[PDB]
């Protein structure tokens, strides 16, 4: 289970979206190293221009690559569910604006870790910070709170993202998440703990298409 994460793991991400009716597709690839807690990915909007700011999709775009220290390794649900994988589902409320709903299947297919995502956004304001692309191209660190959900054989997660806005203000994105195993086998249901997450966003100077380079560093504690 955790044996699959002993070294570098290539990743594929596939997302199909519809936000306020604007359909779009994103494809991503890169690699993850759970030993370091390191994720390194590049995403391309394949249908043209992304109708939403890239930072709003960071959380949607593989927590099995979190580094769990040795004394916390029996609390790593994400790896224990591999390779058959897990369903990750979210609702994300952007304060005073729209909401996203996402369903993602994260599982090994061969040696590649794949994240396949369907995203539906509604209630966004035409002249608001998200459909107006008034979000800065950065991210902040956040703690993610992980609880067991023995009844569905998985975990529930709640956390709030602070997106920096181009005017100095901050826009909150309230995340509700649950993960349930795809496989019929047994998983690790953890005690309460959190993942400390850092994310850095950049651009490929040689990439002419609309895109985002994402680096994440993730570590468990508590």
């Amino acid at each position: 289970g955790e044996e699959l994460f002993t070294g570098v793991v290539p990743i594929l991400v596939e997302l199909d979206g519809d936000v306020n009716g604007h359909k779009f597709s994103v494809s991503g690839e890169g690699e993850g190293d759970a030993t370091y807690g390191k994720l390194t990915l590049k995403f391309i909007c394949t249908t043209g221009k992304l109708p939403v700011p890239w930072p709003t999709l960071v959380t949607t775009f593989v927590q099995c690559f979190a580094r769990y220290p040795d004394h916390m390794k029996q609390h790593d649900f994400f790896k224990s569910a591999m390779p058959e994988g897990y369903v990750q589902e979210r609702t994300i409320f952007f304060k005073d604006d729209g909401n996203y709903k996402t369903r993602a299947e994260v599982k090994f297919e061969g040696d590649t870790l794949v994240n396949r995502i369907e995203l539906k956004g509604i209630d966004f304001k035409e002249d608001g910070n998200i459909l107006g692309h008034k979000l800065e191209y950065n991210y902040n660190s956040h703690n993610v709170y992980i609880m067991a959900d023995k009844q569905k054989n998985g975990i529930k997660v709640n956390f709030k993202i602070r997106h920096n806005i181009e005017d100095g203000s901050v826009h909150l994105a309230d995340h509700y998440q649950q993960n349930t195993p795809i496989g019929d086998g047994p998983v690790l249901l953890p005690d309460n703990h959190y993942l400390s997450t850092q994310s850095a966003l950049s651009k490929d100077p040689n990439e002419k298409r609309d895109h985002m380079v994402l680096l994440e560093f993730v570590t468990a504690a508590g």
Epitope: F93, R103, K120, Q178
Partner: nanobody, 116 residues
Framework: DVQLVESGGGLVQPGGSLRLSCAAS????????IGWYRQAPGKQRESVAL???????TYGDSAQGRFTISRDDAKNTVYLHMDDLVPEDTAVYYC??????????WGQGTQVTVSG
Amino acid sequence: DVQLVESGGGLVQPGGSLRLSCAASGEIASIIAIGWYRQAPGKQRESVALITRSGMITYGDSAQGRFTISRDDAKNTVYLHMDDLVPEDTAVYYCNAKKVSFGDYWGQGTQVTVSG
């Protein structure tokens, strides 16, 4: 399954105030947000006010600081306080409850009419 019961619609004069309430029953633990949408004549449904399990509050454009939403987590009821009402607030107000997965829960709808 969860069930939503609405009450408190009706006739009101301009400048006056109204309250809507909505009680939810059944699988309460799955609800992450509850609140209200409205649909005015000839217009598409627009979100008005929600409050999430964490207590965060989110208003659509029709609020304009005139609508307030509160939640009685004990009696699993949500309330919409609407005041300084105008004729253009005339519409059908729908209670709405959200879960993490696709697909919402909706109430039957309640008419609100503002006129002299």
